[PDB]
């Protein structure tokens, strides 16, 4: 499936779940 509507979601939904992996691991970084 390669739809204009699908790309619009997965152009945003794919990098935002990659970034929520980052910031949640940023919370457990000690000084």
């Amino acid at each position: 499936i390669f739809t204009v509507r699908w790309l619009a979601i997965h152009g945003i939904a794919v990098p935002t779940i990659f970034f929520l992996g980052a910031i949640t691991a940023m919370q457990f970084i000690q000084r």
């Binding site: 204009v4 509507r5 619009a8 990098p15 970034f19 980052a22 940023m26």
Partner: protein, 346 residues
Amino acid sequence: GTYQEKRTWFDDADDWLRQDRFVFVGWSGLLLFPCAYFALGGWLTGTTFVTSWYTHGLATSYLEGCNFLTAAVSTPANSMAHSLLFVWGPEAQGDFTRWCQLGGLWAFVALHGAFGLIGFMLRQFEIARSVNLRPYNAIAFSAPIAVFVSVFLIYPLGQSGWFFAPSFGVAAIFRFILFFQGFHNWTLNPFHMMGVAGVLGAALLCAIHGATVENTLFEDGDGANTFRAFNPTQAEETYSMVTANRFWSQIFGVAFSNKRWLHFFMLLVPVTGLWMSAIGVVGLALNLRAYDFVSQEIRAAEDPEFETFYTKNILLNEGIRAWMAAQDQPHERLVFPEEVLPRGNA
């Protein structure tokens, strides 16, 4: 048309582009969608991982402990001051991880945001011509473009650097606002005093017209949930323009009588406000600011008994300039003894 000309490849491409869909692409989508996507995606990348420790000398990322309020895609340093900071250009020379460190990811967002805002305004033209409407939605969106272009582009291209632009962050705006009070006395520029009246005046027309309509409705249903009683294809209107006239005519004194003029008046008040505030930033870009009244600085010079709140504001602008500019402008390399800065007592 009406003489049977043939179809070329460009004509075939147009039908796919102006095909109705869940999201409208059009021709302006080629300018909008790859320029808007990289703008906010370049904002979320910079606020999360990319530092500002080499440009300003202060941490700005979630990877450094800054929260949602204190993260910012910071402006470049005042060394460059007007370069476009291309990733291939001489200040970067191809290396990406050194390109972000010089603050060049600011110019990636500001320049790809400007061609987004051209493209989004072009989006409102070809949709309106497709549905055959009038272009007034496009004409209103010029006022957010005039604020964007003057503040983020014309103002650094008049001052000494891209350094003095706003940074794309929450608290970074909050110093840019506080920059303009001490260093410019921006609250006494009447072009901002007409900007406020546009903003607060349009907030008032959003609250009255939304409440006058809602309280003069016509009883058309029988359930008290009055949102259920609106078939949107109905020929009659849903509220009473006669009754709404007589309410504000006796409450306030003068009221509307023309539903066409009313919604156009709600168009004119916010658009004039921002357009009359884009002019004031142009004067600040040349430092043609309305800082002083001459005939009261003279009178306060010769007499220690006369003052106003105006002369009390000039001292507070001195308190912003002589204090924060040690860290705010680190390229000026200046240090201060604790006796040269003005204070009161204790």
